[PDB]
């Protein structure tokens, strides 16, 4: 219990100095979540599409217009309406076809 | 009119407590100064600009070795406020021809003649 940080969340910390005093050794094994700290999976009722569809239920006038649709989308994702509007063709043609990819 | 200033001599007469505070003996005075520029001569009068170039302190935070003799001290008093004066100290003695290439000036003001870059052990 020499560590100054609790060992119960991320990892156990053991700090030690080598006898010479020129190295600092840290032993940090990970902590596993105890079984008693977990919940059973809710087996009774799933693809993320199904969850999306229920949130964006088509109720009024069959397909909604841009205005009503955008307000429905904004509430579901906690965004503003402005994000969902399109852009003109100057901006669309500026977008790179093949952006660089890192790993 | 802004003009060159003459400091009263009492400023440079130390007190017994000063020797204890700075740890310098009034006898056996140190021989060489370590002087670094720590302020800019911009916005300072031209006479202060001149001495800084005479003393070699054009670059800031780069130490210059100077003689602890009255004539040099007179110039240093002109720019006292723009510099830090530190006594050069020789724990292991003056560098010789053999050790001239192995010296190092420490921040403490000590010129060591053997610099190894190894743990003291």
């Amino acid at each position: 219990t020499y560590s100054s940080l609790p060992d119960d969340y991320n990892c156990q910390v053991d700090l030690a100095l080598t006898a010479d005093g020129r190295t600092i050794v840290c032993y940090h094994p990970s902590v596993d979540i105890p079984y008693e700290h977990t919940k059973p999976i809710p087996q009774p009722d799933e693809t993320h599409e199904q969850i999306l569809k229920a949130k964006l239920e088509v109720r009024k006038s069959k397909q909604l217009e841009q205005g009503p649709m955008i307000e429905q989308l904004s509430k579901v994702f906690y965004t503003t309406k402005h994000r969902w509007y399109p852009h003109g063709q100057y901006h669309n043609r500026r977008k790179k076809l093949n952006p660089p990819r890192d790993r | 009119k802004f003009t060159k200033s003459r400091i009263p001599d009492k400023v440079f007469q130390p007190k017994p407590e000063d020797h204890e505070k700075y740890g310098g003996d009034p006898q056996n005075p140190h021989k060489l100064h370590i002087v670094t520029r720590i302020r800019s001569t911009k916005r300072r009068p031209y006479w202060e600009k001149d001495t800084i170039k005479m003393l070699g302190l054009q670059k800031a935070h780069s130490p210059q070795i100077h003689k602890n003799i009255p004539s040099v001290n007179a110039k240093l008093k002109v720019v006292k406020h723009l510099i830090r004066i530190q006594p050069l100290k020789l724990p292991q003695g003056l560098p010789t021809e053999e050790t001239m290439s192995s010296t190092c000036l420490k921040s403490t003001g000590e010129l060591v003649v053997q610099w190894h870059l190894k743990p003291v052990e």
């Binding site: 020499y2 700090l15 100095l17 080598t18 006898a19 190295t23 600092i24 050794v25 | -």
Partner: protein, 159 residues
């Protein structure tokens, strides 16, 4: 009630809580035991990928085997020639890490790299702002570059 006793109040005690450090004697025994355990892990080879923090050129690089580093200057090494990185500040594994003060000993860590490419940077435009700026008062800076592939990070039981 002892002398200089103040009843508990809002300002009687400092906001912070004083902590009691373990006595040095017991800690040193535990310190040696901790070091011994880690040394066995190194000795028995109970580790996977290693990552090291290395001081090369003027910069520090978090490094792991198969990694690529770009150095913004010429190095004087032929392409394909293997090198040892000698200033390691940290070597780490899944379960342990070793910290230098400030540098780890050569006995512990050996980091090897290879020169893969010697190149130049793309043209960088250096144009200052001045009266009558003009379009031709322009400088192009191209700097030699070196690319190093980290090959191995190895540790030995010499704690």
């Amino acid at each position: 009630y002892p002398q200089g006793y103040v009843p508990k109040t809002s300002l009687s005690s400092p906001p912070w809580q004083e902590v009691v450090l373990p006595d040095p004697v017991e800690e040193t025994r535990h310190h040696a035991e901790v070091v011994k355990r880690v040394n066995e892990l190194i000795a028995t080879g109970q580790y996977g990928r290693l990552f090291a923090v290395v001081h090369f050129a003027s910069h520090q690089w978090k490094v792991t085997a198969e990694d690529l580093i770009l150095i913004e200057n010429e190095l004087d090494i032929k392409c394909g020639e293997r090198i040892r990185l000698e200033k390691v500040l940290l070597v780490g594994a899944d379960n342990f890490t070793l910290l230098g003060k400030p540098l780890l000993r050569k006995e512990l860590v050996r980091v090897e790299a290879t020169v893969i490419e010697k190149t130049e940077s793309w043209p960088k435009i250096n144009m200052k702002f001045r009266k009558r700026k003009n379009f031709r008062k322009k400088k192009i800076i191209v700097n030699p570059q070196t690319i190093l592939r980290i090959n191995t990070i190895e540790i030995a039981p010499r704690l």
